[PDB]
C-alpha cells in the first residue's frame, strides 16, 4: 500500500481481524504495521491554496 | 436490457444518481412554480349568480358552466391554440384545479377588489371599486360616476377585442 502522509498514534479500537481503515474517498485512513501489530493513523500532509 | 452494459456502467459510479436527482429537482420545482403563481388564495371565491356589476361584463373571463372543463371562453381559446427510459410526470395541479384558482382570483377581485389579497374579503360594488382604482391613478370619483356607462362599454369592447385578437393571431 503506497501513499504519503503523517503517521501518528491512534486511539481507534481496531478489532483483531481488522487490518486497515478506509474513508469515503476509498483512501487508507489507518493502517496496522507488520512486525509491531500496532495501529497507526494516517493523516494527509498539510496543503492549501496560496 | 443488456446485463454486460449495466456491469460496465457500474464502473462510472453515481452519474445516473446525479442525473436523476437533477431531473427530480426540476420536476418538483415546476410544481413549486405553479403553486407560487396560482395558489395565492386559501379561499375559493364564487361570483354571485346575478351578474349585475354596474354594466361591466365579465362573461369572456368568468368560467362557462356549459363547458365540461368549467373554463372561461378566453381560457378555452388559450387551451385550444396551444398544442427508452423516458417518462413524463404529470403535474401536481390539474388544469381544472388551476382554472379553479383563476376563477377564485377573478371572483375575489370582482366582488371584493384588493381587500381579499390583504385579509378577509370585503364586498364592495364594482363601480365603486373602479372608482377607488380611479383614485389610485389620481382621477376623482365623479369622473367615473358620471361616465360609468361609457367606461363599462369601453371595458366590454376591449375584452371582446382581446378575444378577437387572440383568436385571429397565430
Amino acid at each position: 500500500l503506497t501513499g504519503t502522509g503523517v503517521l501518528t498514534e491512534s486511539n481507534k479500537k481496531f478489532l483483531p481481524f481488522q487490518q486497515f481503515g478506509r474513508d469515503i474517498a476509498d483512501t487508507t485512513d489507518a493502517v496496522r504495521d507488520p512486525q509491531t501489530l500496532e495501529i497507526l493513523d494516517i493523516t494527509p500532509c498539510s496543503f492549501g491554496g496560496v | 436490457d443488456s446485463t454486460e452494459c449495466s456491469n460496465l456502467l457500474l464502473q462510472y459510479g453515481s452519474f445516473c444518481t446525479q442525473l436523476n436527482r437533477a431531473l427530480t429537482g426540476i420536476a418538483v420545482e415546476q410544481d413549486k412554480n405553479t403553486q407560487e403563481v396560482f395558489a395565492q388564495v386559501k379561499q375559493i371565491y364564487k361570483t354571485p349568480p346575478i351578474k349585475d356589476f354596474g354594466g361591466f361584463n365579465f362573461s369572456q373571463i368568468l368560467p362557462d358552466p356549459s363547458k365540461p372543463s368549467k373554463r372561461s371562453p378566453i381560457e378555452d381559446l388559450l387551451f385550444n391554440k396551444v398544442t427508452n427510459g423516458l417518462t413524463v410526470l404529470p403535474p401536481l395541479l390539474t388544469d381544472e384545479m388551476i382554472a379553479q384558482y383563476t376563477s377564485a382570483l377573478l371572483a375575489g377581485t370582482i366582488t371584493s377588489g384588493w381587500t381579499f389579497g390583504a385579509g378577509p374579503a370585503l364586498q364592495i360594488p364594482f363601480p365603486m371599486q373602479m372608482a377607488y382604482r380611479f383614485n389610485g391613478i389620481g382621477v376623482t370619483q365623479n369622473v367615473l360616476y358620471e361616465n360609468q356607462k361609457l367606461i363599462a362599454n369601453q371595458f366590454n369592447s376591449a375584452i371582446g377585442k382581446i378575444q378577437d385578437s387572440l383568436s385571429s393571431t397565430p
Partner: protein, 50 residues
C-alpha cells in the same frame, strides 16, 4: 385523496352593500431567503492526480 384547493367562500356581493372593518390585527410573518452558499475551492490537479 383529491386535494382541496381551499375553504369555500361566497362573498355576499350586492350592488349597494359594502363591508368595512371595525377592528384590525397586527400580524407579523416570517420570510426566509438564502443569501450565500459555502465557498468551496477544489484544487483540480490535486483532486484528479493527488
Amino acid at each position: 385523496y383529491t386535494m382541496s384547493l381551499g375553504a369555500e367562500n361566497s362573498v355576499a356581493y350586492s350592488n349597494n352593500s359594502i363591508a368595512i372593518p371595525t377592528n384590525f390585527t397586527i400580524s407579523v410573518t416570517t420570510e426566509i431567503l438564502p443569501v450565500s452558499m459555502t465557498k468551496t475551492s477544489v484544487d483540480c490537479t490535486m483532486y484528479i492526480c493527488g
